[PDB]
């Protein structure tokens, strides 16, 4: 019964078009609870879950301030990075950052994270020991020394191991009904005959939460999933998820094929026979 | 709760 809290930040330069775009989103498992968007009206950190609303003036004032600090640091970084790589002022660039923490079944600290990317790939990441940095290139080395001198990992470690887990637990309790919930998938199959000699079986998992799930096609031991089509687990729109897998089984062997559903809301892994 | 000490790159 593990959990995790994560924050995602996105920065995009707008060449010839003013200030860059800044989006910040916070999540507790698969459930988002806050957001900040530079294009939005309020210009403050906002709630996206019902349980975060009864937090108070001091919470929203502080979160707003802190989100503006991150936007400022990012806004400045876009210029810095273009400097390091000597890029033109003509092109648009992206910076993304993520950090959070995972707690075990007992809600005690497990893992801590802090990654940073530029133009879609890793630039610099804190190591699992929360005391070291991994640089992606010579330019990222500049940042690494700069951060070592600035004592940043020291600061993150304190946060990711403490505050982060302290607050997560706070949210877990406050969102007791929503977050600590677990929904088993409403599974079923479907068969689409292409012709007299070509059949398609589709395993269907629907209405499950969290999104963690693994679907496997197996013919009494046969590793068919190696040749199975699986779609990215998608959101239904009401807090639950959906996913499916399908294989082209030549008419006849279809009844020997069975699907395997894996989800935390199911005691024993379901095996559906056709 | 957000982190309180971001630093430029």
């Amino acid at each position, epitope marked *: 019964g593990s959990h995790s809290m994560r924050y995602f930040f996105t920065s995009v330069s707008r060449p010839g078009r003013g200030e860059p775009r800044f989006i910040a989103v916070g999540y507790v498992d698969d459930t988002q609870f806050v957001r900040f968007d530079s294009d939005a009206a309020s210009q403050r950190m906002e709630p996206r879950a019902p349980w975060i609303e009864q937090e108070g003036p*001091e*919470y929203w004032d*502080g979160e707003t*301030r*802190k989100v*503006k*600090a991150h936007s*400022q*640091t990012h806004r*400045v970084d876009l210029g810095t990075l273009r400097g390091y790589y000597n890029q033109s002022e003509a092109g648009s660039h992206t910076v993304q950052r993520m950090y959070g923490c995972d707690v075990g079944s007992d809600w005690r600290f497990l893992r801590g994270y802090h990654q940073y990317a530029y133009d879609g790939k890793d630039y610099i990441a804190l190591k699992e020991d929360l005391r070291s940095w991994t640089a992606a290139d010579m330019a990222a080395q500049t940042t690494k020394h700069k*951060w070592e001198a*600035a*004592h*940043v990992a*020291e*600061q993150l470690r*304190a*946060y990711l*191991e*403490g*505050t982060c887990v*302290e607050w997560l637990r706070r949210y877990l309790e406050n969102g007791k009904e929503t977050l600590q919930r677990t929904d088993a998938p409403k599974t079923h199959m479907t068969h689409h005959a292409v012709s007299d000699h070509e059949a398609t079986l589709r395993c269907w998992a629907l209405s499950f939460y969290p999104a963690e799930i693994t679907l496997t096609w197996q013919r009494d031991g046969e590793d068919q999933t190696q040749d199975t089509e699986l779609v990215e687990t998608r959101p239904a729109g009401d807090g639950t998820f959906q996913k499916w897998a399908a294989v082209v089984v030549p008419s006849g062997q279809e009844q020997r094929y069975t699907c395997h559903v894996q989800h935390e809301g199911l005691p024993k892994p379901l095996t559906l026979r056709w | *709760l*957000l982190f*309180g*000490y*971001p*630093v*430029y790159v």
Partner: T-cell receptor
Amino acid sequence: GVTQTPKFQVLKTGQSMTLQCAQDMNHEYMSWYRQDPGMGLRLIHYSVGAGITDQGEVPNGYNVSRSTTEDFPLRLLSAAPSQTSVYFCASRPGLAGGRPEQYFGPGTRLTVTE
Amino acid sequence: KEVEQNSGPLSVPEGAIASLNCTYSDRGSQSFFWYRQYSGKSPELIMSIYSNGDKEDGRFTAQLNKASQYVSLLIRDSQPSDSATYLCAVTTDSWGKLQFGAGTQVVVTP
């Protein structure tokens, strides 16, 4: 560290005066406080970066600027007897560093008479 | 946000323990400090705690109880030079405002 001048100053109501303050730690966040026996320290003004300036708890009667990141001068335009107090200047790193510690300056003692 | 500090003058004999308490209101506070101010001088930093626990470096010992929103400072082996007024400060972020307590006066009699 943080240096500030003058150390002492006598002025009469109406005289203007500027309390200079400087830091060489490459800090982006500097502030001004006044310390009175009955209230302790009270923020007057503060600045998180160059060109960015905001009023604190008791900004009335004080002026402030920040063209550079190294200095943060507090300017009284027309002295008042209530402005008699001890002025401490202080600084934190801001977005330029992960160390939360704020450092105070030596202090300046000022007195005003009508 | 506000910080409430110990009390008035705390007198202790040379060699004894001087223990100070501190309490804050903003639950989201992330950084905590202790300053020592000698009469007619500027506040000097002596302790910083970023995790809740016991930081005992030097002759000073600092405790942080986030759940109870409480901070401490125990001065072991008291010297009369310790006579100063101690200020408790707390903050949320790098752009947050530092907030001090009214200050608690310690007098180590010889």
